[PDB]
Design a protein around this ligand. Structure first.
Ligand SMILES: C[n+]1cn([C@@H]2O[C@H](COP(=O)(O)OP(=O)(O)OP(=O)(O)OC[C@H]3O[C@@H](n4cnc5c(=O)[nH]c(N)nc54)[C@H](O)[C@@H]3O)[C@@H](O)[C@H]2O)c2nc(N)[nH]c(=O)c21
Ligand SMILES: C[S@@+](CC[C@H](N)C(=O)[O-])C[C@H]1O[C@@H](n2cnc3c(N)ncnc32)[C@H](O)[C@@H]1O
Ligand SMILES: [Zn+2]
Ligand SMILES: [Zn+2]
Lengths: 120, 294
């Protein structure tokens, strides 16, 4: 409840969140982790869970800072990238799924996380 | 412990046919908690979906699903996300809660469920609503109104023939009228998840709405039977059913949607409805908005 009000007192919520947890702040809690068969393709964002054995799947709205904080999404189309879909997070980064999504981008040709699955 | 590997327990006809007074519910493991891997409501909804996987649910294209009481204290909606994982990709999920929240539904409506205006008929109703004042137990356990009045009217007017409902009840959060409406479906039960077996919570299931009385039910007596069943039935907390999720997703049955007048509903149609092989409703575009009440 503190970090969410923190990103409402600045013009750059992404930087405000990342600076907070990078300085030791507690990541946003209550992301909706799903129980999945770890037999998915492993892509970043998918209509159904696609976690591999090295991933965990989250409900998309719950790992989106703009959804969680009820602020305007930065996408020029206005539609959220995660909401209504499932997001795969590397298992070693489940401590901060919201921070992970703000810090990484899916390969626009390859659909996998750049640096976490993309081989291009 | 085979029952530990099932998603939960469903009320058997053995207890449906009893004739007893309404007694207090006394569970041996009351309010015990099982550690989760993950919100408990993730396992609760998945186990509900697993049981519905064994029911004759109608599963059409553009399936219309409304999910009441989808929010939580934390402002998130684990059950809605499980419904997204479970349902077909082209299913339309509308959810609602008194309090603000964010979810993976297609449409999210804030406010009292009475403000939710369903313009057309839907295929599946999931309710997890529960009024906090139900905890103020005073002088005998009587039938409740609250959101049950809205849900009963919804079943009679805004539920497709062939559609189904799953409505959360507890020892003290229940409705005579809703139990009696279960007699207008091809089949009904109360399902209790193993993940929350230590609660008097149960999901009252109506499978395949027929719009006509198939079973005459004394709703007050039937709740007394439900409590009789819970008081007589050991239920161990478990999530073993969630170990193998290879077949968790709802079967893509491609159930057809047909428009028929009441006069044309013969024995064939009723049979198809009762087998989960047919829906009768409009096939326009779904319009579900928030109404401004007086
Ligand atoms: C069955 N029972 C009732 N009482 C007495 O009956 C009164 C009314 O019951 P009531 O109808 O709430 O039902 P229960 O408390 O199951 O509901 P339970 O709370 O599971 O669930 C009700 C609602 O709370 C919600 N809820 C309960 N726990 C949590 C939680 O930990 N987290 C979240 N998010 N929600 C919760 C739950 O999902 C549902 O919406 C209660 O105050 C009892 O003390 C019993 N007392 C004893 N000693 N032994 C019993 O077996 C017993
Ligand atoms: C156990 S919680 C829902 C938990 C949620 N299903 C999940 O997946 O975590 C009970 C919910 O019922 C909602 N509720 C109670 N009465 C309602 C009503 N009349 N209209 C809409 N929502 C209601 C409460 O605000 C609360 O969010
Ligand atoms: Zn978002
Ligand atoms: Zn790539």
């Amino acid at each position: 409840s503190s970090v969410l009000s923190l990103v409402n007192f600045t013009v750059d919520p992404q930087k405000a969140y990342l600076d907070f947890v990078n300085a030791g702040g507690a990541p946003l809690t209550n992301c909706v982790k799903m129980l999945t068969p770890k037999t998915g393709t492993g892509i970043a964002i998918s209509v159904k869970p696609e976690s591999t054995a090295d991933q965990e799947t989250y409900g998309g709205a719950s790992v989106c800072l703009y959804c969680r904080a009820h602020i305007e999404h930065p996408d020029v189309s206005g539609v959220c990238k995660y909401k209504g879909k499932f997001v795969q997070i590397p298992a070693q980064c489940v401590r901060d799924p919201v921070g992970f999504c703000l810090s990484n981008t899916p390969c626009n040709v390859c659909q996998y996380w750049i640096g976490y699955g993309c081989n291009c | 412990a085979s029952a530990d590997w099932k998603p939960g327990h469903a009320m058997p006809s053995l207890f449906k046919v009893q004739n007893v007074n309404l007694e207090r519910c006394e569970l041996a493991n009351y309010k015990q908690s099982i550690p989760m891997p993950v919100h408990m409501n993730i396992a609760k909804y998945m186990q509900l979906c697993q049981y519905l996987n064994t029911c004759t649910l109608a599963v059409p294209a553009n399936m219309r699903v409304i999910h009441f009481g989808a929010g939580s204290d934390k402002g998130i909606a684990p059950g809605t996300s499980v419904l997204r994982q479970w349902l077909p990709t082209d299913a339309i999920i509308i959810d609602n809660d008194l309090n603000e929240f964010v979810s993976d539904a297609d449409i999210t409506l804030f406010g009292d469920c009475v403000t939710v205006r369903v313009g057309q008929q839907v295929d599946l109703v999931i309710s997890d609503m529960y009024d906090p004042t139900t905890k103020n137990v005073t002088g005998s356990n009587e039938s409740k109104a609250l959101f049950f009045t809205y849900l009963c009217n919804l079943i009679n007017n805004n539920l497709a023939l062939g559609g189904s409902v799953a409505i959360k009840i507890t020892e003290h959060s229940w409705s005579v009228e809703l139990y009696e409406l279960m007699g207008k479906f091809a089949w009904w039960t109360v399902f209790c998840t193993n993940a929350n077996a230590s609660s008097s919570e149960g999901f009252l299931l109506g499978i395949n709405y027929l719009g006509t009385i198939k079973e005459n039910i004394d709703g007050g007596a039937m709740h007394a039977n439900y409590i009789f069943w819970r008081n007589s039935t050991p239920m161990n907390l478990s999530t073993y059913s969630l170990f193998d999720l290879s077949k968790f997703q709802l079967k893509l049955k491609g159930t057809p949607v047909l428009q028929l007048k009441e006069s044309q509903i013969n024995e064939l149609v009723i049979s198809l409805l009762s087998q989960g092989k047919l829906l009768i409703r409009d096939n326009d575009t779904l319009s579900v908005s928030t109404d401004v009440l007086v």
